[PDB]
Symmetry: D5
Subunit: 131 residues, 10 copies
């Protein structure tokens, strides 16, 4: 068995190919996935896994230099919007309209679907560099 790194095999393969600036998406159960974009669904039941738990695992296994979320999250989802701010303190956090957000997902290397059943609980993690 693999000693270090993320446990999920599908995710490990995605992280392995990440280059500087590549993007991956963590989505709630409702976010549509653009055609041609790999979808890794971790959902089990409503609320499992949670957006927060998923983002937390990714944060410790991936080097993030920028996080992008939809502005609507600040109003419609205060708890998760705060979570992001807290978790990605040293990272640049950019906000866009949900509409522009969805356009950006087309360039993502993959979309990770969580069991999150709350509005605008989605974010794009942009890969940084280790040197």
């Amino acid at each position: 068995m693999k000693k270090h790194g993320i446990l999920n095999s599908h995710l490990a393969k995605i992280l392995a190919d990440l280059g500087h600036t590549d993007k991956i998406v963590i989505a709630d159960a409702g976010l549509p996935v653009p055609d041609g974009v790999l979808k890794i669904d971790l959902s089990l039941k409503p609320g499992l896994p949670a957006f927060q738990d998923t983002a937390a695992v990714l944060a410790e296994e991936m080097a993030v230099e920028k996080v992008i979320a939809a502005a609507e999250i600040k109003a419609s989802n205060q708890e998760n919007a705060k979570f992001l701010e807290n978790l990605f303190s040293e990272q640049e956090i950019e906000y866009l309209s949900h509409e522009e957000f969805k356009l950006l997902t087309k360039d993502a290397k993959a979309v990770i679907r969580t069991g999150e059943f709350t509005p605008y609980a989605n974010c794009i993690l942009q890969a940084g560099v280790l040197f």
Copy 2:
């Protein structure tokens, strides 16, 4: 969005094709997957999701006529062994050696990998019929 059934898209597709006697496997994080058998990895980190959480969702979404587990589970993993007895109290439960158990996994339509980090926490759910 889909209104009924299991939330996970990968899993919904497998359940959709199940016919009477078809088998699927719920596995701990260390079980090897035979060549040619589809693997759906739901693991996020050690213990998440657990074997019990996963098995309970599946029992809720599919008609199970028989459950197969490795005898070594009773001795080495009492808690989970008892959970199974309770969960599938109405179904027939068969115990084989872990060796025979693995051979049987070759005929599975899929292996669902959980984040379970305890010995012999695996089982085969054999589809029953709705009429």
Copy 3:
């Protein structure tokens, strides 16, 4: 076997992947299917299954936020036009020219072909969200 949800295995796989705003098409036996769009043919013979029967099953298994249909249906197929208005009373129904309607089908995730032998008995169901 799968306990809940739509019975058809092909349709279950399509519904499983539906995200907010994704579209599927229910069509009569003559609608042309754009290249690249998955075609699921349920027809057995003229009138079987009927447009009404198919639309009714989907309405109960999928969350629909909007229905799109061709204006011509109100002229050449009042029967089915009324059925649609009644079935989706709570949803927004938009009428476009049959020409524009066909253009939109290029963006569908699938086209479900029925055995309906009446003109303009086609509609686009746009997925809603469960939360």
Copy 4:
């Protein structure tokens, strides 16, 4: 549009390739489909379409020299058993155990899944020759 023959596009392609002695299967909603065998699912909901309706359409579009069914159908599903004897009065009908029947389905060119929710409502149609 195609003027003659079976209306369903998937079935038309299968019939088009039929040679003398090739077999296709008409099955209830629970019959398991062997790996490697094409599955065409026409089901919409329980009982739709029915075994009888599907078998009748195929009987008129395909030349059948022999019909194979499971002996158990005469015991648990007399209704459909009589239908079959009547529909294929001119053809040779053979009864085998459900177990052997399933074995034979491995050699079929396709399995047509209906919405039939009654036991052993399955049959194998063996192609005849037009000259």
Copy 5:
């Protein structure tokens, strides 16, 4: 064996998928086939089968609402030009320059190659509807 419809298996599969306005091409032995368009070659030797024999079988098996040919056929291939007028007397026949004709073939679902060895012996059959 299949009882009704066109005898050729490759062709049956194409007709099976035709929807209103879909196009197929019948071509002489020299017409170039655009990239991405399926080619079904029925030629055996020069003149076998002929454009006329092929066109007549197709007119018998598919509903044609419009026929498109190259204007150069009237001048250089009078016999075949007249055959078409007679065969599709009830349909609308449109003549374009051979140059425009070829561009149009890019949208065809298939090109049927015949053994015809005479100039501009090609046409596009546009599927009509059965209701």
Copy 6:
């Protein structure tokens, strides 16, 4: 355009790869094609092309060192059985039971389906060598 050789593009590709002893089959409209064997269907309508016309074209484009047919042809199809004898004078003609014949087709590089509607009008041509 290709100056020499057989006109049919599908057949040209098959002849191009023939090595000493490789086999190809010419079949009537009813012969079943084993799985994994390429099928090139030239049929247009019953009796077109004819078994005789097809075999004749192949005879002049391919080096045949042996022909294999089913014994039943001699009795059930005297006209075509004589044709073969006449056409392949200098070639070794071996006869087998239709049953053994079908077993041999599994090793064929391809099956050429003609529009021949007569019993046992099938034969296997075994490639010779040009030096």
Copy 7:
């Protein structure tokens, strides 16, 4: 074995599909092959096969309507430039800049690589018609 036509199986397959105006490229060992264009490498070692040897064979097996080469060939490879002029006496020979010549190769059905080790020894053969 195949009796007539070009000996090389790969090439026979390419010529088999040639339609009027289709293009193939004969190239020296350094010509780059556009992405998507089929490459058939016949080279064994420098100078074998020679550009002249390959062009001769093709001229004999293909109906050539036009020949295209880079003007630079007259300046740096007069020997091959003269050969080309004589070989295609009856056909149209067009000279373009090497830069435009390369853009044209993107439309070719294939690039045939020879062992030619001399500058600009490349040409495009445009297929003609046999009637």
Copy 8:
């Protein structure tokens, strides 16, 4: 970028799927790779990377339960044979004849080719469990 685990993307993907008892092969530059087994070539030039360098990295990123090598390694490559003994002090090391060793490679999930230019510098690492 990925924070933890092996640096090589190809290898990370292979380790990600490892289950208990799965096997991978580290090989010298001459070891033949069985058909069907994935080959990951890391060699740059003779001796780079070295067998020792590669085995060390893997030992640090993979949970090794058993090591298998050919007895011939003790006779012709004592240096690497000793290295292996020390590196896997706590694990079981089994020696088989080079001939049997090769048969065992057919079951491997992958063969990692190094630049090692010394005889019998190959070994099979059998995955263990993390619990």
Copy 9:
């Protein structure tokens, strides 16, 4: 461009993956290629390239430890048989019946077809090692 090694790109790719004992076949224009074995056709016309020319280039680019040919070559094709003995004087040359030779080609990584038009002009080159 590649500075060193064999010039042919197809062959370069095959040599690149050769491991100790892997085999490749050099064949005359008539040798049949077993299904599943890659065929690289270098023939241009009868006698070009010749068996000898091809074998010479391969011997210079590949480390061969053993050669295998049909016994019939010594009698029916004296010239090439002598060439073989001379070219591979250092290596072991084993002669088998042509029938047994053909069975061995099933294990070859590829069959290189030459334009050689003389009988039994075939041989298997078994890869050696560089250390």
Copy 10:
């Protein structure tokens, strides 16, 4: 085994197809690979293999006419920048902004990933000609 040329099998295959002006990229551990471009990862661990070692091997096995690197390399990575200037003194070296450099990698035939952990350690090698 292959006697000459680059040792790595993956790279050998890429060099084999290089034509005049084709480009390949040597990259540090962080350079992102554009979708559609083949990635060959030779990294083992940070610093192995090094950028310099990889570039040296390639320069010896490929005819390079031009090198392209990011301008930022001269300032942020002086050591490797000097190495580059020294290794490719005969060739033309063009410096572009790193942003413009990345756009150019879209046209590369492949990206070779090294274990280099220093910034802007990337370059594009443009293939020259051997004659």
